[PDB]
Amino acid sequence: NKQIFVLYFNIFLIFLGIGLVIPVLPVYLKDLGLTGSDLGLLVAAFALSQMIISPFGGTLADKLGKKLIICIGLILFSVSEFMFAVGHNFSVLMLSRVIGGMSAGMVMPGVTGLIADISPSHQKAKNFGYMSAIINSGFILGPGIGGFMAEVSHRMPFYFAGALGILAFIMSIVLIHINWKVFITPVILTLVLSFGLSAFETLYSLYTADKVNYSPKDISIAITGGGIFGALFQIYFFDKFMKYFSELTFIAWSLLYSVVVLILLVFANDYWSIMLISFVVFIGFDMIRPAITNYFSNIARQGFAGGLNSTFTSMGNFIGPLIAGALFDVHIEAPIYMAIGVSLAGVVIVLIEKQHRAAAADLED
């Protein structure tokens, strides 16, 4: 059944499109004279539109259909990409970002439901395994696709993504036919992790380009290498670390490592030192994400927990880049301090939760 491959490609491209403007962001800031607040607003608009449209998108899927919603979301994403590749003013860019977010929040529940329905109960894990695989991969391979495609032309990545959207649309047409007192901590951790990751993603593209004259190809190389190294390190060193450590102590240690590597980043000026720092930064976030997911699963109403995780991930992806773009104007190193403070708050929350657990255990006996 090759239709599963088409759905996988659609899920790949939908979350590919969010990170394509990340490496080209300095080029847009220089060309049209946009402030960092504008770029933060663009990425935040994408995330916010997706977050709003996701639930209404799922009923509409219930109301209208499954193939039709998939195709309409794909065509909306394609026209949003072409608008981004054609428009040259703030209003059209905002409209394209909003339409792309709507398309993302419309396809994602639709492709999820279609893949779940088509795949029999034997291997439903795949319907989510290769799923969360691709999403984050895209979330870090989007810049990798972007910056390299920026070498050919400034708007080349968006034309390429529009062509990919048209191809995916054609392929889809052809082929397919409650006590919150305990849940408060993992929600805060998800918000903190999403904030840190998205803020750092905007932070690197703006700050390295402003400081070390990083070309878009250099930013793409750094981000792709960091994401690949993080994924590889997680895959090859997560199970043993969970066996040796616990769920919360390991999260605290990984957030501390993220703080340390961010401090190394803020004190680095050389080209290759900064490249190595970008290589080693993503390990902390790429290792926190599965730990947070496991904590959410263990505490869990599993579907409700997953919905909360996704909703607060979107909330972080909306509230992080906006404040990062706003802060970059005041000081290019300010978002570094913001991310460090957010990670410190996450460590403090983890320590407080551990202390509360210890107190409850002691008082039990």
GROMACS .gro file of C-alpha atoms in nm:
model
  365
    1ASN     CA    1   0.000   0.000   0.000
    2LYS     CA    2   0.180   0.309  -0.131
    3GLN     CA    3  -0.094   0.544  -0.004
    4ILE     CA    4   0.076   0.529   0.337
    5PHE     CA    5   0.385   0.670   0.167
    6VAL     CA    6   0.178   0.956   0.021
    7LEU     CA    7   0.035   1.037   0.364
    8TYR     CA    8   0.386   1.023   0.512
    9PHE     CA    9   0.507   1.266   0.244
   10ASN     CA   10   0.216   1.501   0.315
   11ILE     CA   11   0.293   1.498   0.688
   12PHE     CA   12   0.659   1.554   0.602
   13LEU     CA   13   0.594   1.855   0.379
   14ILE     CA   14   0.335   2.021   0.604
   15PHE     CA   15   0.585   2.055   0.890
   16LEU     CA   16   0.867   2.108   0.641
   17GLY     CA   17   0.702   2.435   0.539
   18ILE     CA   18   0.713   2.594   0.885
   19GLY     CA   19   1.093   2.597   0.906
   20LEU     CA   20   1.175   2.704   0.549
   21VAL     CA   21   1.170   3.076   0.633
   22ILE     CA   22   1.405   3.019   0.928
   23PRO     CA   23   1.739   3.021   0.738
   24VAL     CA   24   1.618   3.284   0.488
   25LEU     CA   25   1.489   3.507   0.771
   26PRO     CA   26   1.793   3.743   0.774
   27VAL     CA   27   1.764   3.781   0.395
   28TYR     CA   28   1.402   3.892   0.434
   29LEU     CA   29   1.494   4.122   0.723
   30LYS     CA   30   1.761   4.293   0.512
   31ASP     CA   31   1.568   4.306   0.183
   32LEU     CA   32   1.240   4.458   0.305
   33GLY     CA   33   1.383   4.621   0.618
   34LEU     CA   34   1.173   4.415   0.859
   35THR     CA   35   1.251   4.425   1.229
   36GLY     CA   36   1.301   4.108   1.431
   37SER     CA   37   0.954   4.159   1.574
   38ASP     CA   38   0.810   4.118   1.224
   39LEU     CA   39   0.982   3.782   1.167
   40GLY     CA   40   0.886   3.660   1.513
   41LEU     CA   41   0.530   3.766   1.431
   42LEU     CA   42   0.543   3.566   1.106
   43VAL     CA   43   0.649   3.240   1.271
   44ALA     CA   44   0.415   3.304   1.565
   45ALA     CA   45   0.130   3.363   1.320
   46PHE     CA   46   0.194   3.027   1.155
   47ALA     CA   47   0.197   2.849   1.492
   48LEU     CA   48  -0.107   3.037   1.627
   49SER     CA   49  -0.315   2.978   1.314
   50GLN     CA   50  -0.235   2.606   1.325
   51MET     CA   51  -0.322   2.592   1.696
   52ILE     CA   52  -0.658   2.766   1.645
   53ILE     CA   53  -0.759   2.568   1.337
   54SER     CA   54  -0.666   2.219   1.461
   55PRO     CA   55  -0.989   2.143   1.657
   56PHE     CA   56  -1.225   2.309   1.409
   57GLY     CA   57  -1.026   2.127   1.142
   58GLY     CA   58  -1.098   1.792   1.304
   59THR     CA   59  -1.469   1.841   1.317
   60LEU     CA   60  -1.469   1.978   0.964
   61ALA     CA   61  -1.300   1.648   0.878
   62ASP     CA   62  -1.585   1.474   1.058
   63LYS     CA   63  -1.837   1.697   0.879
   64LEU     CA   64  -1.695   1.695   0.524
   65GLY     CA   65  -1.474   1.393   0.458
   66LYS     CA   66  -1.120   1.257   0.461
   67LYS     CA   67  -0.984   1.270   0.105
   68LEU     CA   68  -1.144   1.609   0.038
   69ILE     CA   69  -1.000   1.773   0.349
   70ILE     CA   70  -0.656   1.626   0.276
   71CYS     CA   71  -0.661   1.766  -0.078
   72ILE     CA   72  -0.797   2.107   0.024
   73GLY     CA   73  -0.533   2.138   0.296
   74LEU     CA   74  -0.259   2.044   0.050
   75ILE     CA   75  -0.380   2.300  -0.205
   76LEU     CA   76  -0.411   2.567   0.066
   77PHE     CA   77  -0.053   2.497   0.176
   78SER     CA   78   0.066   2.514  -0.185
   79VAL     CA   79  -0.106   2.847  -0.251
   80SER     CA   80   0.033   2.982   0.077
   81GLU     CA   81   0.383   2.882  -0.034
   82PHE     CA   82   0.332   3.047  -0.372
   83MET     CA   83   0.205   3.361  -0.198
   84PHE     CA   84   0.521   3.365   0.013
   85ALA     CA   85   0.730   3.312  -0.302
   86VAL     CA   86   0.546   3.594  -0.483
   87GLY     CA   87   0.449   3.853  -0.222
   88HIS     CA   88   0.683   4.134  -0.121
   89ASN     CA   89   0.490   4.317   0.153
   90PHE     CA   90   0.402   4.249   0.515
   91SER     CA   91   0.028   4.195   0.463
   92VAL     CA   92   0.070   3.921   0.203
   93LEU     CA   93   0.340   3.752   0.411
   94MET     CA   94   0.111   3.748   0.715
   95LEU     CA   95  -0.177   3.615   0.505
   96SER     CA   96   0.043   3.339   0.361
   97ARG     CA   97   0.166   3.241   0.707
   98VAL     CA   98  -0.192   3.231   0.839
   99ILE     CA   99  -0.311   3.023   0.544
  100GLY     CA  100  -0.016   2.787   0.586
  101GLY     CA  101  -0.098   2.743   0.953
  102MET     CA  102  -0.461   2.674   0.865
  103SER     CA  103  -0.344   2.418   0.608
  104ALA     CA  104  -0.117   2.252   0.865
  105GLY     CA  105  -0.392   2.230   1.126
  106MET     CA  106  -0.631   2.102   0.860
  107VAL     CA  107  -0.410   1.830   0.707
  108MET     CA  108  -0.257   1.698   1.030
  109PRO     CA  109  -0.579   1.565   1.192
  110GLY     CA  110  -0.698   1.450   0.849
  111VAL     CA  111  -0.384   1.253   0.764
  112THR     CA  112  -0.376   1.117   1.119
  113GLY     CA  113  -0.732   0.988   1.093
  114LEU     CA  114  -0.688   0.852   0.742
  115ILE     CA  115  -0.370   0.662   0.833
  116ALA     CA  116  -0.533   0.528   1.150
  117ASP     CA  117  -0.839   0.408   0.955
  118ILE     CA  118  -0.645   0.250   0.668
  119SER     CA  119  -0.381   0.077   0.884
  120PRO     CA  120  -0.529  -0.228   1.062
  121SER     CA  121  -0.495  -0.274   1.438
  122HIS     CA  122  -0.181  -0.485   1.390
  123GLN     CA  123   0.062  -0.194   1.352
  124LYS     CA  124  -0.113   0.122   1.477
  125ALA     CA  125   0.214   0.210   1.652
  126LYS     CA  126   0.358   0.287   1.309
  127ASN     CA  127   0.069   0.529   1.246
  128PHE     CA  128   0.229   0.726   1.524
  129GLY     CA  129   0.587   0.601   1.516
  130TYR     CA  130   0.703   0.717   1.178
  131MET     CA  131   0.458   0.995   1.242
  132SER     CA  132   0.631   1.182   1.522
  133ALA     CA  133   0.945   1.078   1.347
  134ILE     CA  134   0.889   1.289   1.040
  135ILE     CA  135   0.738   1.592   1.212
  136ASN     CA  136   1.035   1.677   1.418
  137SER     CA  137   1.273   1.570   1.146
  138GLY     CA  138   1.096   1.823   0.928
  139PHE     CA  139   1.101   2.081   1.207
  140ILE     CA  140   1.481   2.063   1.188
  141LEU     CA  141   1.524   1.960   0.823
  142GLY     CA  142   1.313   2.252   0.700
  143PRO     CA  143   1.606   2.491   0.737
  144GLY     CA  144   1.827   2.221   0.587
  145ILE     CA  145   1.606   2.215   0.279
  146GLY     CA  146   1.571   2.593   0.295
  147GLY     CA  147   1.920   2.737   0.317
  148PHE     CA  148   2.068   2.513   0.049
  149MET     CA  149   1.777   2.600  -0.180
  150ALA     CA  150   1.848   2.963  -0.092
  151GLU     CA  151   2.179   2.925  -0.276
  152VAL     CA  152   2.004   2.900  -0.614
  153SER     CA  153   1.775   3.197  -0.546
  154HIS     CA  154   1.637   3.398  -0.256
  155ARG     CA  155   1.280   3.274  -0.315
  156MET     CA  156   1.381   2.934  -0.456
  157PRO     CA  157   1.294   2.730  -0.140
  158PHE     CA  158   0.934   2.850  -0.146
  159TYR     CA  159   0.894   2.775  -0.518
  160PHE     CA  160   1.037   2.428  -0.450
  161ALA     CA  161   0.796   2.374  -0.161
  162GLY     CA  162   0.505   2.490  -0.376
  163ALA     CA  163   0.602   2.244  -0.648
  164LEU     CA  164   0.627   1.972  -0.382
  165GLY     CA  165   0.281   2.068  -0.257
  166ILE     CA  166   0.136   2.045  -0.607
  167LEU     CA  167   0.301   1.705  -0.655
  168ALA     CA  168   0.168   1.583  -0.319
  169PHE     CA  169  -0.182   1.705  -0.408
  170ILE     CA  170  -0.166   1.518  -0.740
  171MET     CA  171  -0.039   1.203  -0.567
  172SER     CA  172  -0.314   1.221  -0.304
  173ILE     CA  173  -0.577   1.265  -0.576
  174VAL     CA  174  -0.444   0.972  -0.778
  175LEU     CA  175  -0.362   0.721  -0.504
  176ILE     CA  176  -0.585   0.734  -0.195
  177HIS     CA  177  -0.945   0.617  -0.228
  178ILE     CA  178  -1.002   1.575   3.600
  179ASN     CA  179  -0.747   1.689   3.858
  180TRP     CA  180  -0.508   1.934   3.691
  181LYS     CA  181  -0.300   1.947   4.011
  182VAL     CA  182  -0.093   1.654   3.881
  183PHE     CA  183  -0.101   1.753   3.513
  184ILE     CA  184   0.025   2.106   3.582
  185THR     CA  185   0.394   2.008   3.578
  186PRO     CA  186   0.422   1.821   3.242
  187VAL     CA  187   0.223   2.099   3.072
  188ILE     CA  188   0.468   2.359   3.205
  189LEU     CA  189   0.759   2.141   3.094
  190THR     CA  190   0.614   2.106   2.743
  191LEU     CA  191   0.563   2.482   2.723
  192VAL     CA  192   0.919   2.545   2.843
  193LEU     CA  193   1.070   2.297   2.596
  194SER     CA  194   0.874   2.432   2.300
  195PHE     CA  195   0.961   2.789   2.400
  196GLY     CA  196   1.330   2.705   2.426
  197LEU     CA  197   1.346   2.514   2.099
  198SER     CA  198   1.156   2.768   1.887
  199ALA     CA  199   1.328   3.067   2.049
  200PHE     CA  200   1.668   2.908   1.983
  201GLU     CA  201   1.571   2.829   1.623
  202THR     CA  202   1.488   3.194   1.553
  203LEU     CA  203   1.778   3.306   1.774
  204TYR     CA  204   2.045   3.122   1.578
  205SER     CA  205   1.926   3.245   1.238
  206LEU     CA  206   1.915   3.607   1.351
  207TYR     CA  207   2.208   3.623   1.593
  208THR     CA  208   2.471   3.422   1.404
  209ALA     CA  209   2.397   3.613   1.084
  210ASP     CA  210   2.421   3.944   1.271
  211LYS     CA  211   2.739   3.852   1.462
  212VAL     CA  212   2.961   3.625   1.250
  213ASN     CA  213   2.823   3.714   0.904
  214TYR     CA  214   2.685   3.362   0.864
  215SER     CA  215   2.556   3.293   0.515
  216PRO     CA  216   2.221   3.115   0.474
  217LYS     CA  217   2.415   2.807   0.364
  218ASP     CA  218   2.616   2.822   0.687
  219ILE     CA  219   2.300   2.854   0.897
  220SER     CA  220   2.144   2.563   0.709
  221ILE     CA  221   2.455   2.349   0.761
  222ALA     CA  222   2.468   2.430   1.132
  223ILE     CA  223   2.099   2.361   1.192
  224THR     CA  224   2.097   2.040   0.987
  225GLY     CA  225   2.408   1.910   1.160
  226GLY     CA  226   2.269   1.995   1.502
  227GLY     CA  227   1.939   1.822   1.430
  228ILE     CA  228   2.104   1.513   1.283
  229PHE     CA  229   2.347   1.488   1.575
  230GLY     CA  230   2.065   1.532   1.825
  231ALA     CA  231   1.852   1.263   1.662
  232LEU     CA  232   2.145   1.020   1.638
  233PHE     CA  233   2.254   1.083   1.997
  234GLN     CA  234   1.899   1.036   2.124
  235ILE     CA  235   1.852   0.711   1.932
  236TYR     CA  236   2.187   0.567   2.039
  237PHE     CA  237   2.198   0.693   2.400
  238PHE     CA  238   1.842   0.738   2.532
  239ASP     CA  239   1.748   0.388   2.646
  240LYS     CA  240   2.062   0.337   2.855
  241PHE     CA  241   2.025   0.683   3.010
  242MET     CA  242   1.664   0.610   3.107
  243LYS     CA  243   1.778   0.276   3.251
  244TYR     CA  244   2.045   0.445   3.463
  245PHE     CA  245   1.855   0.764   3.551
  246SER     CA  246   1.496   0.859   3.639
  247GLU     CA  247   1.231   1.059   3.455
  248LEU     CA  248   1.280   1.391   3.639
  249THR     CA  249   1.647   1.386   3.740
  250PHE     CA  250   1.742   1.320   3.377
  251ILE     CA  251   1.521   1.608   3.260
  252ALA     CA  252   1.692   1.838   3.510
  253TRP     CA  253   2.035   1.721   3.393
  254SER     CA  254   1.947   1.771   3.026
  255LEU     CA  255   1.812   2.121   3.092
  256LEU     CA  256   2.133   2.198   3.282
  257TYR     CA  257   2.332   2.076   2.981
  258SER     CA  258   2.123   2.301   2.757
  259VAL     CA  259   2.201   2.595   2.987
  260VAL     CA  260   2.573   2.512   2.981
  261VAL     CA  261   2.584   2.483   2.602
  262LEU     CA  262   2.388   2.807   2.562
  263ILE     CA  263   2.640   2.983   2.788
  264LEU     CA  264   2.917   2.840   2.571
  265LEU     CA  265   2.730   2.974   2.267
  266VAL     CA  266   2.700   3.324   2.412
  267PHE     CA  267   3.076   3.327   2.483
  268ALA     CA  268   3.185   3.196   2.141
  269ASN     CA  269   3.298   3.424   1.858
  270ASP     CA  270   3.495   3.198   1.624
  271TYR     CA  271   3.330   3.043   1.320
  272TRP     CA  272   3.409   2.678   1.389
  273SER     CA  273   3.353   2.705   1.765
  274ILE     CA  274   3.004   2.839   1.695
  275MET     CA  275   2.948   2.562   1.440
  276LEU     CA  276   3.047   2.299   1.698
  277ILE     CA  277   2.821   2.466   1.954
  278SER     CA  278   2.528   2.444   1.712
  279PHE     CA  279   2.619   2.080   1.655
  280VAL     CA  280   2.600   2.002   2.028
  281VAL     CA  281   2.311   2.230   2.132
  282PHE     CA  282   2.022   2.025   1.993
  283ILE     CA  283   2.109   1.716   2.200
  284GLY     CA  284   1.945   1.860   2.511
  285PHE     CA  285   1.614   1.943   2.344
  286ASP     CA  286   1.604   1.626   2.134
  287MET     CA  287   1.653   1.425   2.454
  288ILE     CA  288   1.405   1.627   2.661
  289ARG     CA  289   1.122   1.576   2.412
  290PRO     CA  290   1.093   1.194   2.450
  291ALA     CA  291   1.132   1.221   2.828
  292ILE     CA  292   0.845   1.471   2.844
  293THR     CA  293   0.636   1.245   2.620
  294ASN     CA  294   0.706   0.947   2.847
  295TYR     CA  295   0.616   1.152   3.155
  296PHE     CA  296   0.287   1.254   2.992
  297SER     CA  297   0.211   0.892   2.902
  298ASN     CA  298   0.294   0.765   3.252
  299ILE     CA  299   0.088   1.030   3.431
  300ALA     CA  300  -0.210   0.971   3.199
  301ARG     CA  301  -0.743   0.979   2.915
  302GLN     CA  302  -0.430   0.917   2.708
  303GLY     CA  303  -0.583   1.098   2.412
  304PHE     CA  304  -0.652   1.399   2.633
  305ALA     CA  305  -0.288   1.398   2.746
  306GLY     CA  306  -0.169   1.383   2.385
  307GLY     CA  307  -0.401   1.667   2.290
  308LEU     CA  308  -0.272   1.878   2.578
  309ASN     CA  309   0.086   1.801   2.474
  310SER     CA  310   0.022   1.906   2.113
  311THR     CA  311  -0.176   2.216   2.212
  312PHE     CA  312   0.091   2.342   2.451
  313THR     CA  313   0.365   2.257   2.201
  314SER     CA  314   0.182   2.487   1.958
  315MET     CA  315   0.141   2.747   2.234
  316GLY     CA  316   0.516   2.741   2.293
  317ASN     CA  317   0.591   2.756   1.921
  318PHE     CA  318   0.369   3.065   1.909
  319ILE     CA  319   0.483   3.248   2.224
  320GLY     CA  320   0.855   3.177   2.195
  321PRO     CA  321   0.954   3.304   1.850
  322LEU     CA  322   0.745   3.620   1.891
  323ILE     CA  323   0.918   3.724   2.213
  324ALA     CA  324   1.255   3.617   2.069
  325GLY     CA  325   1.206   3.845   1.769
  326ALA     CA  326   1.090   4.126   1.996
  327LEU     CA  327   1.393   4.084   2.224
  328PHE     CA  328   1.648   4.059   1.941
  329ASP     CA  329   1.593   4.429   1.866
  330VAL     CA  330   1.691   4.534   2.219
  331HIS     CA  331   2.002   4.315   2.227
  332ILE     CA  332   2.121   4.036   1.999
  333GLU     CA  333   2.224   3.839   2.309
  334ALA     CA  334   1.897   3.901   2.495
  335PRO     CA  335   1.715   3.592   2.355
  336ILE     CA  336   2.006   3.381   2.481
  337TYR     CA  337   1.940   3.511   2.832
  338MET     CA  338   1.566   3.455   2.785
  339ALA     CA  339   1.622   3.092   2.685
  340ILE     CA  340   1.864   3.040   2.975
  341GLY     CA  341   1.609   3.184   3.217
  342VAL     CA  342   1.332   2.965   3.077
  343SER     CA  343   1.553   2.657   3.114
  344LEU     CA  344   1.636   2.762   3.472
  345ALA     CA  345   1.263   2.793   3.541
  346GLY     CA  346   1.216   2.443   3.401
  347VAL     CA  347   1.490   2.309   3.629
  348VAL     CA  348   1.330   2.486   3.926
  349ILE     CA  349   0.990   2.337   3.841
  350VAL     CA  350   1.143   1.989   3.811
  351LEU     CA  351   1.316   2.028   4.148
  352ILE     CA  352   0.995   2.152   4.312
  353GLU     CA  353   0.797   1.859   4.171
  354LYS     CA  354   1.063   1.614   4.290
  355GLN     CA  355   1.057   1.771   4.637
  356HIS     CA  356   0.677   1.746   4.647
  357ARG     CA  357   0.693   1.380   4.540
  358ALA     CA  358   0.950   1.306   4.810
  359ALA     CA  359   0.740   1.483   5.073
  360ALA     CA  360   0.429   1.289   4.970
  361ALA     CA  361   0.620   0.960   4.978
  362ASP     CA  362   0.763   1.036   5.323
  363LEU     CA  363   0.423   1.143   5.460
  364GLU     CA  364   0.265   0.827   5.318
  365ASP     CA  365   0.475   0.610   5.551
   0.00000   0.00000   0.00000
